Scaffold this active site. Structure first.
Site, short mmCIF file in Angstrom:
data_model
loop_
_atom_site.label_atom_id
_atom_site.label_comp_id
_atom_site.label_asym_id
_atom_site.label_seq_id
_atom_site.Cartn_x
_atom_site.Cartn_y
_atom_site.Cartn_z
N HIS A 215 5.19 10.61 -0.17
CA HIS A 215 3.79 9.62 -0.66
C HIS A 215 2.90 9.91 0.44
O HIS A 215 2.12 8.62 0.82
CB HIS A 215 4.42 8.27 -0.59
CG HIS A 215 5.62 7.60 0.57
ND1 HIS A 215 6.59 6.55 1.07
CD2 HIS A 215 4.00 7.45 1.92
CE1 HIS A 215 6.98 7.04 2.80
NE2 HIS A 215 5.78 6.53 3.16
N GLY B 142 3.48 3.52 10.21
CA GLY B 142 2.45 5.09 10.54
C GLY B 142 4.61 5.60 10.50
O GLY B 142 5.12 6.67 11.38
N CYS C 90 6.75 6.28 9.02
CA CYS C 90 8.05 6.43 7.55
C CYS C 90 8.02 8.13 8.21
O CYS C 90 7.40 8.72 8.59
CB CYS C 90 7.20 6.54 6.26
SG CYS C 90 5.57 6.02 6.90
C1 LIG Z 1 5.10 4.99 5.87
C2 LIG Z 1 4.91 4.00 6.25
O1 LIG Z 1 4.43 3.96 7.92
N1 LIG Z 1 4.47 2.83 5.28
C3 LIG Z 1 3.99 2.79 3.71
C4 LIG Z 1 5.17 2.65 3.61
C5 LIG Z 1 5.12 2.84 1.85
C6 LIG Z 1 3.69 3.34 1.11
C7 LIG Z 1 3.56 3.41 -0.20
C8 LIG Z 1 5.00 4.12 -0.70
C9 LIG Z 1 2.87 4.22 -0.01
C10 LIG Z 1 3.78 1.95 -0.54
C11 LIG Z 1 2.58 3.46 2.43
C12 LIG Z 1 2.70 3.28 3.68
C13 LIG Z 1 4.12 1.95 6.21
C14 LIG Z 1 3.24 0.67 5.41
O2 LIG Z 1 1.76 0.45 5.28
N2 LIG Z 1 4.15 -0.22 4.81
C15 LIG Z 1 4.44 -1.55 3.76
C16 LIG Z 1 4.40 -0.84 2.09
C17 LIG Z 1 4.28 -1.36 0.87
C18 LIG Z 1 4.74 -2.78 1.41
C19 LIG Z 1 4.47 -3.42 2.49
C20 LIG Z 1 4.76 -2.68 3.25
C21 LIG Z 1 5.12 1.19 7.53
C22 LIG Z 1 4.79 -0.22 8.02
C23 LIG Z 1 6.34 -0.23 8.84
C24 LIG Z 1 7.60 0.00 8.69
N3 LIG Z 1 7.63 1.35 7.42
C25 LIG Z 1 6.23 1.42 6.60
#
Ligand SMILES: *CC(=O)N(c1ccc(C(C)(C)C)cc1)[C@@H](C(=O)NC1CCCCC1)c1cccnc1
Ligand SMILES: *CC(=O)N(c1ccc(C(C)(C)C)cc1)[C@@H](C(=O)NC1CCCCC1)c1cccnc1
EC number: 3.4.19.12
Lengths: 304, 304
Positions: free
Chosen positions: A41, A143, A145
């Site tokens: 992603h 961030g 991930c």
């Molecule tokens: C990668 C990252 O930190 N986060 C994230 C996770 C998933 C995505 C998509 C698969 C493209 C939707 C993007 C970014 C963030 C985050 O913003 N997560 C959200 C994803 C959509 C649903 C609500 C959470 C993140 C923040 C905290 C912990 N893990 C991931």
């Protein structure tokens, strides 16, 4: 003496953590041999987060499109391939700090140390378990991930988890390092609900055995029970079934403490049916289910 | 989202851990620059553990008497001196993996990451606090002494604790890295009793602010109070006094959440006077006092 939630030393993994930037979006990557692993992603944009077509995003994408940095050191990208929900990036240099490493898919209830990272830079470690519903109760900000979970066997690092996303619950879902998600989740912004979480019964028993060893034994009753009789009271309290494999695994703890597994099962039944009455077991007013028999042995043996 | 007990990455400290053998007794040592630091009770024998004369044990002792090993690598000893309850060993080689380092003496309530070691080999990390009685609730088996506690500021490693001994309670006492014991303890087998332990009030408030941020706010009441009125109820429940310095330190958490410190003080008074009624705050049926305001900020900010 004493009993703490304990992570492995993070040094071996600290030297595998890189940054992966692609367009605007930056996240964490793992660098082992001449390959860099990260969540797929990173080829998403703020428009395509709803339902991205990852095959059609990777096709319109080249080696030079991916920016990889280890501190103030830039790695060249020679190849790229997508495996399930993970990106793999072939790079000109091989990581000089690569340890002895395996990729394993852990079972529900099995525990591991997480190293939380932001921009390929570690910020801390904690221990946690793969819950029965295939989520984890972790600590992850935006961030995070790409951050990985691992166990250490002598000097061999078994990678079991890569972090991806957060569910509306505030709990966390991710993959093994072949890019297969733990549980039935997908990498997109949609209605993903985790199931009702159960308690890891074999882990609570192991925790009770640690308490006996460390001198906390007020909860030890004068009854015994059967597997079938105990498993009946377990399902009642959202406790995972106890198996003949679970009783076998506890045999070492059973032997050392002189308490038969079914006697400890009977003691647990009493704690479930009566509560704790505002008392503490190893400094906890709850039943702790995020310690494995191997965790308890390791910490009560002193295995380096 | 989520909130976990979190240690610093242990990598920088992993490469400072050596073995120190002297006669029969072996324990853990810290190797920074051309000096190796370890507990002075490595010059003890099974006879002298009752009341050793350390000045008369070090006088009848030479450079070659001390055996120091970093893996399968032997270091030569060029000098030795005793500082309080710590041995310092000058060695021919300077540690090539020495980080940016300070020695600091932490206050009661201040937290740090412990790296538990046996035979100069790390086995795990956990976070913990210096209790008001000047002990720590840690996880240490035989040969754990020499293991160190530390905090990380950017890439600078502040060493605050070296482990020494265990009290009949099953809790742990040790020194700063100038060899001064935290609290009124001495390095011998005698009747050493820690005082009645109080709760780190400023840390419980900080923990409550983390809960509000992570969506757990059932405990938020509709009252306020004063410092004097709250401090009266604190002493009652073995809670450390709240100071004008404690309220100042919480100002950042106060600002972000929109909850005045004395409003959170009032909410805490209700939890102390009514209990939790078998409810959970950040997955804990107890009040957690082993998180500092800086710990909560760090974990809820994402400081690498
Ligand atoms: C990668 C990252 O930190 N986060 C994230 C996770 C998933 C995505 C998509 C698969 C493209 C939707 C993007 C970014 C963030 C985050 O913003 N997560 C959200 C994803 C959509 C649903 C609500 C959470 C993140 C923040 C905290 C912990 N893990 C991931
Ligand atoms: C160094 C070590 O691991 N332990 C230890 C501590 C203190 C001493 C003396 C100062 C010479 C008495 C020797 C060895 C051991 C240990 O056996 N501690 C006992 C010390 C006497 C009172 C009862 C505990 C140890 C074990 C577990 C945790 N920390 C230290």
């Amino acid at each position: 003496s004493g009993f703490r939630k304990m992570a492995f030393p993070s040094g071996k993994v600290e030297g595998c953590m890189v940054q992966v930037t692609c367009g605007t979006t930056t996240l964490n990557g793992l660098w082992l041999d001449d390959v860099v692993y990260c969540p797929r992603h990173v080829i998403c944009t703020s428009e395509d987060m709803l339902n991205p077509n990852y095959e059609d995003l990777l096709i319109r994408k080249s080696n030079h499109n991916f920016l990889v940095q280890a501190g103030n050191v830039q790695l060249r990208v020679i190849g790229h391939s997508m495996q399930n929900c993970v990106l793999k990036l072939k790079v000109d240099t091989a990581n000089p700090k690569t340890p002895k490493y395996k990729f394993v898919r852990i079972q529900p209830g099995q525990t591991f140390s997480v190293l939380a990272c932001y921009n390929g830079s570690p910020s801390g470690v904690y221990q946690c378990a793969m819950r029965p519903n295939f989520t984890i109760k972790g600590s992850f900000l935006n961030g995070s991930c790409g951050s990985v979970g691992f166990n250490i066997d002598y000097d061999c690092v078994s990678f079991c988890y890569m972090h991806h996303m957060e569910l509306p619950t505030g709990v966390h879902a991710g993959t093994d390092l072949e890019g297969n998600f733990y549980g039935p989740f997908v990498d997109r912004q949609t209605a993903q609900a985790a199931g009702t979480d159960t308690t890891i019964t074999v882990n609570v028993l192991a925790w009770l055995y640690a308490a006996v060893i460390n001198g906390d034994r007020w909860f030890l009753n004068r009854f015994t029970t059967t597997l079938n009789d105990f498993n009946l009271v377990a399902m009642k309290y959202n406790y995972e079934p106890l198996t003949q494999d679970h009783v076998d695994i506890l045999g070492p703890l059973s032997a050392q403490t002189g308490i038969a597994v079914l006697d400890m099962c009977a003691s647990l039944k009493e704690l479930l049916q009566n509560g704790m009455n505002g008392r503490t077991i190893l400094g906890s007013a709850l039943l702790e289910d995020e310690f494995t028999p191997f965790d308890v042995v390791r910490q009560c043996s002193g295995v380096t």
